[PDB]
Each structure stands twice: as structure tokens, then as C-alpha cells.
Amino acid sequence: LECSWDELWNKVQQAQDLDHIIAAHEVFLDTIISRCLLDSDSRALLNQLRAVFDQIIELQN
């Protein structure tokens, strides 16, 4: 989150084009979709993470 926001803030700050501010927003999203387990390849990793989330809610019982 902080790292992707850094690039976004820098690139909107320096730029002189609003076509290149639609290039600061967009790369900020593209960082979030790749680092965090949200894209189609990372579904298998997320499938493992769901079991851990289940183990957490089990302790609540």
C-alpha cells in the first residue's frame, strides 16, 4: 500500500499531462494486483490462505 502510493503521489506531482496521471493511478492499481494475492495465478496461493483464515475463525470457538 505505502510503496504503491509513493509512486502514485510522485507521478501525479511531477507530471504535466493528465494522460500521465491516468498512468499514475493505473500503475498504483497494477502494483496492488501483483504484490497482493489477487490475480489469477495467485488464486492457488490464496486457496492456501483461506485454510489459515478458517483456522483463525476456528479458535474463536
Partner 1 sequence: KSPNVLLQNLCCRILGRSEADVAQQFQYAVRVIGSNFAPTVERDEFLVAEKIKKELIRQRREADAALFSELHRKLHSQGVLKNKWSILYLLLSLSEDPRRQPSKVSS
In the stretch 25-44, what mask flags binding to partner 1 with x, by CB under 8 A? ------------------x-
Kindly tell me the number of DSSP H helices and DSSP E strands found in the chain.
3, 0
Tell the smallest beta-carbon distance from residue 38 to partner 1 (Å): 9
Does residue number 50 form part of the binding site for partner 1 (CB under 8 A)? yes
Helix (H) or strand (E) holding 54: helix 43-59
User: Which residue, 15 or 38, is less far from partner 1 as judged by CB?
Assistant: 38
Given CA atoms 40, 44, 50, 52 in this order, what sign does their dihedral have?
negative
Which residues of this chain interact with partner 1, rule CB under 8 A? 43, 47, 50
